[PDB]
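Lab notebook, bench 4. We co-purified these components, and the gel suggests they stay together. Before we commit to crystallization screens, I want a quick structural picture of the whole thing.
Request: model the full complex, all chains together.
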Amino acid sequence: SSQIRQNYSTEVEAAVNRLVNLYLRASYTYLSLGFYFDRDDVALEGVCHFFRELAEEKREGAERLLKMQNQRGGRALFQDLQKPSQDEWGTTPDAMKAAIVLEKSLNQALLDLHALGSAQADPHLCDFLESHFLDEEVKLIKKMGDHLTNIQRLVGSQAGLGEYLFERLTLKHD
Amino acid sequence: SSQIRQNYSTEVEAAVNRLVNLYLRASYTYLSLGFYFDRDDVALEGVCHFFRELAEEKREGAERLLKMQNQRGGRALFQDLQKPSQDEWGTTPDAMKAAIVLEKSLNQALLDLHALGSAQADPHLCDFLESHFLDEEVKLIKKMGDHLTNIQRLVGSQAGLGEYLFERLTLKHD
Amino acid sequence: SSQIRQNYSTEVEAAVNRLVNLYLRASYTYLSLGFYFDRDDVALEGVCHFFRELAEEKREGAERLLKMQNQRGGRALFQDLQKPSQDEWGTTPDAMKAAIVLEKSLNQALLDLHALGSAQADPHLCDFLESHFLDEEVKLIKKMGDHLTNIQRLVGSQAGLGEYLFERLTLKHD
Amino acid sequence: SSQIRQNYSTEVEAAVNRLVNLYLRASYTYLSLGFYFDRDDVALEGVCHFFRELAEEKREGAERLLKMQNQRGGRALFQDLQKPSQDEWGTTPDAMKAAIVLEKSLNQALLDLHALGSAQADPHLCDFLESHFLDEEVKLIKKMGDHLTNIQRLVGSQAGLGEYLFERLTLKHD
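Here is the predicted assembly.
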């Protein structure tokens, strides 16, 4: 009952543990989206790639949260990781739509943990969220909105041709 | 009432000041077109890029005009910069059409300042316009006509697909 | 009515648009101060340089604000840029005094936007202002106070000699 | 009675020969100003340097005029070079004032030769003056106005100290 702990409330500690689980479930969801687009009957490599790099990024965010929990004298507790909500993910637009509501969920959780940190007067936790997660999420959600707009333009024009072109010309860049 | 000034009429001086304001308003208009295409619901990066590089180029032309005003012993006077005429710019074709009538406006202003310089018998002002602005405008307007022809070909064929392909295949080159 | 927007109030959005205009008018003011010191009858190159680099810096801050507006799902709106308040700027001390009240104005606007962001509980906006504008302004205002003290020392001693020496020995360094 | 000559009037030819003599007399005047500031009882090396580099530049302009005379099928004729109007040149301000009325004289002669070329409809002569002499003169006269303003500021404040400081801090740069 740490020699280290200072200005680290049990309710922030508990919320950090809940955020780790969210980040780990987001990663598990992205693992599933990545491998779905690698299916021979789906076969969109740029999209597979995009979701597999996000799986890593989310796993990395969870580890950063775990490192911090320890730096602060809190104790990590792990819970079950619920399987992704879908087994099959549709087409690229369906997938992108799913990924953006997932990101908005994690962004709200970040925002709520920050409000708790503000309320508990924990400046270090608030700096940590600001410098490592908050801008990362704003930038990723913007990138996903942009991609949603480009796919919708294409698929509106010619669904099959549009999915292939987006994967070749955008996701085989960014 | 310069020790430097020689063969620099007050009406050329006044026109140079008016041209600076035009160039600065053209730059402000291109700033607005660039950021409009960066909107998550517009999302055409090549187009954003194209207009933001023109914003710089126009700002640069104004500064070159200001440097010259001073070299000649004239006095710069600045006026308000009126906001761009549109808040939202439509699609790429609409935007390109707007940018070419803007360029033709500045080209006419250049041509008229040159006619005044010819009439006032100011050879230096005429050389300055010839060597720095007149060919730059002819080349840019040709580039914009070419781009207008390519977009119209595409958007005629398949509006959404056509805008995306132009942005990927042309403006992600020139 | 963005697919992206989250925790971004209309009053922060409106204030960001107002801050862009301030930054753009500050840049236009610095453009005028820079070119005034380039006049053959003023001729202080170090001072011209100092204000022209600030014109760029302010223009850059406006663009960073515009990039953020978009990242957040807000819509940029542009307004007229009012001409600078003076046509002629006096001597270096007069100019420096003008530039520091201008900087204090923008610093107050930053501080007020931050207070609104704090009040709206927008942590990302507050981090953005902290990491990109707030320390930049504190450091620039300190530099301008220091320069004001050095010029006043000099010009107190010998006005013409003092302006020339400051321009040669300080502004032809920092 | 050249096999080469085309659209080159005898009155332009005669004026070019007169301009050579002016350029050569301007060079001879700058030779005298340079060596005057090298006198042990004047001893301002930066000023000596400034005028000796202008002597070279004027000599070079004359040779360029002579090369062109020949390219066009005209015949160079040389006349006496009248000695400089002063034997002793006063102080730096006196010298700079003298050099700027000298430059304005040559600039008027350029402008008048151009008006004759315009009137004779000789486009090549007009391009030649525009691309090689007209901007060179505008830029040099601006530099001399700026230097006049800086010296007057200094010498107003402390004549001897002011001349030494200008020579050390400006002309031992530009």
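DSSP finds four helices and no strands in chain A. Worth comparing against the SEC data before the next meeting. The domain at 1-174 of chain A is CATH 1.20.1260.10 (Ferritin).
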